[PDB]
Symmetry: C3
Subunit: 155 residues, 3 copies
């Protein structure tokens, strides 16, 4: 009634946390380092499993800060009571492929990351780190009626 | 209380179905064949009508499989109690227009469809078939308070 | 119980309104004129503040008409009980940058706006006006359980 079952699949997974008694969602962390070049799609593994009860739906959705600063687009996933296992972040680096090159990757804050080893990246590329806040989980009550076909509507 | 009114506008419409007693959503099928080239927007007709009651909101949203595999982006529609009639899938083929050509279209599983008649398509194009699972419907309770203007907030 | 606290930060802000007793959402208006060229991201200020209670989450999401007609993509924001202040519309002009030019901007209805003063714009650019319906607010009950780590799931 007042508890949610959470399972960690690997050592690299972090426990989802509710920062404040007013923060409606739960912070979801990445369990792998992914380099996403322009227009690239990926399903980023969190290595976290949830057992949501019946009559409820989970919303694995993007953070307001990351989505506004970066070209990283997270398609909101619907977490049912039936689907157990590794939760994937449905993501796409929506930055355009302009065929231009740069020597800097960008973090989830759109800031240039200065690495010691010099490499050539395609412009607009992003990098996501381990245990990094990229998405959040939102559980909302869901209404299930048994639908019947009608020729016309009434009240 | 435990029933939803569903209307089929044409012979090409399919009845929305809840596969399992745990599947929180209802599978929504396409009622037309649409070829979407890169960057193209469309409102795909389902020929299905719903009569959602007051205090509830419908969410016509993308499937996890289709949205992760293909460049097809479905903007989640909000189905009110007032709007009756043909439900449209707000979609966009988000694949970039690179001016390149191919002889293969791609299905909702991103697989190459091998057609007998040879044709030239623009690279990144998709095709959606009749009675094909592209989206799903999610009904959630909605809270309506009568808002009042205040100069400062209190409790 | 049946009231929502709404605050207007400036003279350019408009009060969110529920048109009909069946319209599940509240119309959100822009408080500034923004010209968005292809691929450009912005946080459009509404100058409106809300005090959503605990156990509820706000959904600042796009309108069905605007999102289907224009290349303007609004990333749905989650409005918590803790975050008070100016609500920002997380937007991106998803139109491709084809390096082509036109002398017409486009409104939220994708129509060409004919201005007296002749100017050169980049093709696919949009303009948003003051007190213009671009987004809507949807408040949904949110379930908060205290999560506990388990090795395996049970019932
Ligand atoms: Ni959503
Ligand atoms: Ni795009
Ligand atoms: Ni949504
Ligand atoms: Ni949403």
């Amino acid at each position: 009634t007042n508890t949610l079952q959470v399972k960690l699949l690997s050592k690299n997974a972090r426990m989802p946390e509710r920062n404040h008694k007013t923060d409606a969602g739960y912070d979801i962390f990445s369990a792998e380092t992914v380099v996403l070049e322009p227009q690239e799609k990926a399903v980023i593994k969190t290595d976290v499993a949830v057992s949501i009860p019946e009559g409820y739906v989970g919303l694995l959705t993007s953070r307001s800060g990351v989505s506004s600063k970066t070209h990283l687009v997270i398609e909101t996933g619907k977490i049912d009571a039936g689907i157990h296992g590794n939760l994937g972040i449905n993501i796409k680096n929506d930055h355009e492929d302009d065929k231009m090159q740069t020597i800097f990757l960008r973090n989830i804050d759109n800031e240039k990351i200065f690495e010691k080893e010099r490499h050539l990246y395609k412009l607009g590329s992003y990098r996501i780190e381990k245990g990094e806040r990229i998405a959040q989980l939102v559980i909302v009550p869901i209404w299930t009626p048994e639908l019947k076909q009608v020729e016309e509507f009434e009240s």
